[PDB]
Structure formats: structure tokens, C-alpha cells
Design a protein around this motif. Structure first.
Motif, PDB file in Angstrom:
ATOM      1  N   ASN A   1      40.741  42.843  34.229  1.00 31.30           N
ATOM      2  CA  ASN A   1      41.290  44.107  33.756  1.00 31.30           C
ATOM      3  C   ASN A   1      40.852  44.558  32.360  1.00 31.30           C
ATOM      4  O   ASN A   1      40.806  45.748  32.100  1.00 31.30           O
TER       5      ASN A   1
ATOM      6  N   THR B   1      34.803  44.659  34.736  1.00 34.98           N
ATOM      7  CA  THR B   1      36.043  45.441  34.681  1.00 34.98           C
ATOM      8  C   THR B   1      35.931  46.682  35.579  1.00 34.98           C
ATOM      9  O   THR B   1      34.873  46.948  36.140  1.00 34.98           O
ATOM     10  N   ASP B   2      37.013  47.430  35.759  1.00 36.72           N
ATOM     11  CA  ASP B   2      36.965  48.570  36.680  1.00 36.72           C
ATOM     12  C   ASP B   2      35.868  49.615  36.357  1.00 36.72           C
ATOM     13  O   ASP B   2      35.509  50.410  37.219  1.00 36.72           O
TER      14      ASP B   2
ATOM     15  N   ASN C   1      39.409  39.423  42.855  1.00 38.01           N
ATOM     16  CA  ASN C   1      40.231  40.137  41.870  1.00 38.01           C
ATOM     17  C   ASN C   1      40.985  39.085  41.076  1.00 38.01           C
ATOM     18  O   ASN C   1      42.123  38.723  41.419  1.00 38.01           O
TER      19      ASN C   1
ATOM     20  N   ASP D   1      42.065  39.341  38.111  1.00 32.67           N
ATOM     21  CA  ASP D   1      43.202  40.148  37.705  1.00 32.67           C
ATOM     22  C   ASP D   1      43.395  41.209  38.772  1.00 32.67           C
ATOM     23  O   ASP D   1      42.421  41.875  39.154  1.00 32.67           O
TER      24      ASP D   1
ATOM     25  N   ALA E   1      44.164  44.821  40.197  1.00 28.14           N
ATOM     26  CA  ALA E   1      44.079  46.194  39.660  1.00 28.14           C
ATOM     27  C   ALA E   1      45.462  46.785  39.383  1.00 28.14           C
ATOM     28  O   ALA E   1      46.458  46.361  39.974  1.00 28.14           O
ATOM     29  N   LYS E   2      45.534  47.775  38.489  1.00 27.19           N
ATOM     30  CA  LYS E   2      46.824  48.354  38.125  1.00 27.19           C
ATOM     31  C   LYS E   2      47.255  49.489  39.080  1.00 27.19           C
ATOM     32  O   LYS E   2      48.391  49.963  39.023  1.00 27.19           O
TER      33      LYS E   2
ATOM     34  N   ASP F   1      52.167  41.969  38.367  1.00 25.82           N
ATOM     35  CA  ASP F   1      51.522  42.923  39.282  1.00 25.82           C
ATOM     36  C   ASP F   1      52.507  43.535  40.271  1.00 25.82           C
ATOM     37  O   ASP F   1      52.105  44.104  41.276  1.00 25.82           O
TER      38      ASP F   1
END
Length: 158
Positions: free
Chosen positions: A38, A79-80, A92, A94, A96-97, A126
Motif C-alpha cells: 500500500n 504499489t497501486d 496482495n 497489503d 487494497a483500500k 482491512d
């Protein structure tokens, strides 16, 4: 992509992520793969550790993808935030938000052909994506997860 990409999740605490990744990598993979995080600092530090464990890791221009394409580098950490070949596996590290970024990530296994695999590490931080993540997987005939599907935080829209 979620309907047609095989998705797997592991619920854990944050401190457990690095060892689970290593265990996964030790099982062997089809390079190249992509690991998403992230924040860009994460990107750099995770990447170091892997090169420490004797892995060929790129961070994230064109130069990176050539090596991956060539077979030189086997793992892309990112990262994204371009254009890249179909991958056998997306992790993933981390989550995703939001589910739209998650969808775009796992879409990297390719538009078609081999389903590929997206493995997601989920923590309690999350919880606000659990409901949509649950839907993404329940709508995926190429996917098998009661741990998420039955989780108290996956029951109602955030």
C-alpha cells in the motif's frame, strides 16, 4: 477479473505477513509474479528483504519490465500506482483500500488464458473491504472461503 481469476485469502495479523510470504515463495512459482503493497516505503523495504533471501526483485521503468520479461528478475514489488505481461500469481501483501484497486491488481494475471492466482493477506485493519472482498470471491466460480464469508465484519456494507 474477479469472476475469472482464482482468489485465495489468509487472515492473519500484520506481523505474520513476512513469514507467510516466504513460505509461499519457498513452494516455488512461475516468474514473473507481482506483490502489491500500500505504501512506497513498504515497496522498498519488502523488496530488500527478498533480495536478502536470495530473490531477484524489482521495485516500482521500462527497464524493470524487460528483465522480468527476460527472466532476469522474478519478483516485482509495487504499489497501486503501466503495461506488463500476464502473470501466474499476484500477491496482495497489503490488501487494497477499496475493491476497485483490488480488481485492477488481480487483473494482472491476464485478460484470459491461464486463470492465475491472487493471494491476499487480510488483517483486522482491512475490515472495511471484507464485505466487498467476500462478494468478489463468492462471484468467482474459479475460486473456492468460510474464514471471510462467515466473518462478523463481512456481513454488512461498510
Amino acid at each position: 477479473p474477479h469472476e475469472r481469476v482464482e482468489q485465495k485469502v489468509f487472515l492473519m495479523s500484520e506481523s505474520e505477513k513476512r513469514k507467510k510470504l516466504l513460505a509461499i515463495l519457498e513452494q516455488g512459482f512461475d516468474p514473473p509474479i507481482i506483490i502489491f503493497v500500500n505504501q512506497k516505503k513498504g515497496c522498498d523495504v519488502l523488496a530488500k528483504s527478498l533480495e536478502k533471501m536470495g530473490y531477484n526483485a524489482c521495485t516500482l521503468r521500462e527497464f524493470a519490465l524487460s528483465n522480468l520479461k527476460a527472466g532476469a528478475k522474478d519478483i516485482l514489488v509495487a504499489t497501486d500506482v503501466i503495461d506488463i505481461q500476464d502473470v501466474s500469481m499476484v500477491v496482495n501483501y497489503d490488501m487494497a483500500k477499496n475493491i476497485e484497486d483490488y480488481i485492477h491488481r488481480i487483473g494482472r494475471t491476464g485478460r484470459a488464458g491461464k486463470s492465475g492466482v491472487a493471494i491476499t493477506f487480510l488483517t483486522k485493519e482491512d475490515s472495511a473491504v471484507f464485505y466487498e472482498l467476500k462478494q468478489a470471491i463468492l462471484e468467482s466460480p474459479v475460486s473456492s472461503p468460510p474464514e471471510l464469508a462467515n466473518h462478523p465484519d463481512a456481513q454488512h456494507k461498510p
